[PDB]
Amino acid sequence: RAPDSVDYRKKGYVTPVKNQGQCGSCWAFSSVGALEGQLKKKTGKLLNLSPQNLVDCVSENDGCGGGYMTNAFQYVQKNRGIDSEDAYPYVGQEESCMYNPTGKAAKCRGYREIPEGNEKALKRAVARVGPVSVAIDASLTSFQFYSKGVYYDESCNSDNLNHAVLAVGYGIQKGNKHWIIKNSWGENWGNKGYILMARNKNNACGIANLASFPKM
Ligand SMILES: CC(C)C[C@H](NC(=O)c1ccc(-c2csc(N3CCN(C)CC3)n2)c(F)c1)C(=O)N1C[C@@H](N)[C@H]2OC[C@H](O)[C@H]21
Ligand SMILES: NC(=O)CN(CC(=O)O)CC(=O)O
């Protein structure tokens, strides 16, 4: 039976919360979080991978003007690697590609998409695989103003995805089922950079509409 709750933060699969700053790089933070999870599972090592590597080098994406996580995973597979943050640090602006194979810290052998809208399939992937990259509607002030408890707003638009984040678990709080979401807006946002978002409530904020994970 799939567990009632999963929390990758408790098992050492999740790096500290980052700040994307004034750059449309949410997709790169989402991507590296899912890669970091699979790298720890596979090799036993938790380390920061380079979102700047993805911003500068994923030519199917638009760098600081936005991207998709599936394009990030495809790049790491075709490039035969991604650098560590230490080798290729985040500066929050586009520059020409500085990928160096000597800084290589992970590889990718493809990716898988969660069937669109299917919150049970997303739950099974989080339980069996690890942290999963997800897209949400994060446009409401209620989301901006989150501090505690399970986030639900009937005005969230499941059809208008505009933010990429990382699902690092799920569970239930005082009878409210939730997703555990890592954001890239710094530790001073939300609950130390995290938000619990309503689970099995009409696919709230589109959480299962564009979910994916890398294969290693
Ligand atoms: C998973 C999704 C929802 C994430 C979303 N993704 C896109 O919005 C997106 C935008 C652009 C392209 C693209 C790829 S190639 C190209 N262009 C090439 C030629 N030039 C001429 C035009 C642009 N554009 C893309 F793939 C995707 C995103 O990153 N966003 C949404 C924005 N609100 C930003 O805020 C949060 C995040 O920091 C940014
Ligand atoms: N059945 C379990 O141990 C599930 N765990 C979480 C996990 O395994 O990620 C529950 C908890 O830590 O409260």
Note the resolution in Å, 1 decimal: 1.9
Tokens 């689970």, residue located: 199
**Is the C-beta atom of 3 inside 6 A of ligand 2?**
yes
Out of 163, 165, 185, 189, mutate this one to test ligand 1's pocket (max ligand atoms within 8 Å of CB): namely 163
> Looking at the chain, after which residues does the C atom sit over 2.5 Å from the next written N, breaking the chain?
none
Domains of the chain in start order, with CATH, are 1-216 (3.90.70.10)
178 is catalytic: no
Reported as type and span, the H/E element at residue 55 is helix 51-57
- 178 C-alpha to ligand 2 centroid (Å): 14
The phi, psi pair for 177, rounded to 5°, reads -70, 145
97 is catalytic: no
28 in Cβ contact with 51 (< 8 Å):
yes
The neighbouring-strand residues paired with 171 are: 178
- Give the pocket of ligand 1 (CB within 6 Å): 20, 24-27, 61-62, 65-68, 135, 161-164, 210
For the chain, how far is it from start to end, CA to CA, in angstroms?
Answer: 25
> Among positive and negative, which fits the CA dihedral 68, 193, 201, 199?
positive
**Is the C-beta atom of 12 inside 6 A of ligand 2?**
no
Give SS3 for 60.
Answer: coil
- 60 C-alpha to ligand 1 centroid (Å): 10
23 is catalytic: no
Q: Which ligand sits nearest to residue 71's alpha carbon?
A: 1
Of 183, 203, 205, 209, which one is the catalytic site residue? 183
CA 133 to chain centroid, in Å, comes to 4
Nearest CA to ligand 1 atom 8: 66
Query: Which residue from 113, 155, 149, 150 is spatially nearest to 134, judged by alpha carbons?
Result: 113
**Is the C-beta atom of 122 inside 6 A of ligand 2?**
no
Q: Which atom belonging to ligand 1 lies closest to the Cα atom of 163? A: 36
Of 23, 26, 108, 205, which one is the catalytic site residue? 26
**Is the C-beta atom of 7 inside 6 A of ligand 2?**
yes
Angle at 15 between CA 54 and CA 49, to 5 degrees: 25
Residue 113 exposure: Cα atoms within 13 Å on the Cβ side: 11
The neighbouring-strand residues paired with 133 are: 166, 212
Separation CA 48–CA 203 (nearest Å): 30
Q: Which ligand sits nearest to residue 22's alpha carbon?
A: 1
